[PDB]
Amino acid sequence: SWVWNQFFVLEEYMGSDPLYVGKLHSDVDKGDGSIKYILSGEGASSIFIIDENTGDIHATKRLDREEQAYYTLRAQALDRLTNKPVEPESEFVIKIQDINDNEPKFLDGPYTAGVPEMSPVGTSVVQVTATDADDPTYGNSARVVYSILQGQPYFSVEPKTGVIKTALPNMDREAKDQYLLVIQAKDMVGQNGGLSGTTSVTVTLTD
Amino acid sequence: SWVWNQFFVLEEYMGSDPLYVGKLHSDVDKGDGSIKYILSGEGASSIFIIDENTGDIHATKRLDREEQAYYTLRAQALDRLTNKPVEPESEFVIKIQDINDNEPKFLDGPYTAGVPEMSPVGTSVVQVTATDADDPTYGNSARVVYSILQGQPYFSVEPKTGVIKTALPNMDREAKDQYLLVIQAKDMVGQNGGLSGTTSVTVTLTD
Ligand SMILES: [Ca+2]
Ligand SMILES: [Ca+2]
Ligand SMILES: [Ca+2]
Ligand SMILES: [Ca+2]
Ligand SMILES: [Ca+2]
Ligand SMILES: [Ca+2]
């Protein structure tokens, strides 16, 4: 079945005029005001208000998707005289639409890892993980690309997975036993304008 | 029935970023990308574009409610592999929301009229009419109030109907047999921020 019972409103609005969310409407409504539209549920009468005559919903404050990403409300349509329902009460969702306002963050960083000296090229060393609190299903605001800022050509990193691998054969611990890498994670899939985060990786060569 | 299959776009958007309209979704969609969402109908694949994977719809150009107020489209959900439907098609509407961007106009102006001299106060002279291309069905963007800018105290105008009337008694043709009035029509029922238009009325005193 098609799912239609959802509205959205953009997060982090800084204007003074309340944002318009949408309109509750019964097709029984003849435009004569005899139906009263009533809002209940999450944020109802506080964050979200309704005009009982027109069904228009507004949001009354700046909203943060990363605080709560959506709200589940209920809609009623009552006859003004009798207060009896003209429609069955229905749930509906108000979705908080994402903007890219969070940087990728390496929450478990910094990293340390060991790898045997003289490992073959392509040996996995460690997987680093940047988390991006934005919406991974809308645009690229939470779609991250990994890169090595400092550490090429000795190591490589898989751009989508954050797995660091050895890149040079025949590393000698006697010559150099430790490497200090800087890894970047950048959203908007690394495109210009993306937000970024970084972490350090200390790689020790083990015998 | 509750009406949930209606999206909205505010007219006359001048930003470079395409305006987000909303999201199509079938509850057959398991989030694995096996469904393709497609649009057809008014504005499809030109004015309105869709991300086939996510169902997200954007508007690609500035729209004018006074050019077209509504777009009726069809949603389909297709199997990505076979291109065959996994839902019955469903109609939906994109409503273009009004802004007050048209001023009242006296398209049949200016006016000429006669009224007998020595008439009772409140004698009808002529009815002027301003039209306003904005949306009359809600709000005051096309609801006008009439006023006389030049021509008081000799004449008055009914603020809602535009009927111009004599205001002074014992008007004497021999003393003065022609008056030139300037009439204003202002939308937002004459409130501050309303747009305005004017016309003139040449009134002759008769027997
Ligand atoms: Ca936020
Ligand atoms: Ca982000
Ligand atoms: Ca966000
Ligand atoms: Ca317009
Ligand atoms: Ca207007
Ligand atoms: Ca308009």
UniProtKB/Swiss-Prot annotation, chains A, B:
Cystines in this chain: none
Localization in the cell: Cell membrane
The Cadherin domain, residue ranges: 2-106, 107-207
Description of its domains: Three calcium ions are usually bound at the interface of each cadherin domain and rigidify the connections, imparting a strong curvature to the full-length ectodomain.
Cited function: Cadherins are calcium-dependent cell adhesion proteins. They preferentially interact with themselves in a homophilic manner in connecting cells; cadherins may thus contribute to the sorting of heterogeneous cell types.
Protein name: Cadherin-7
Organism in which the protein naturally occurs: Mus musculus
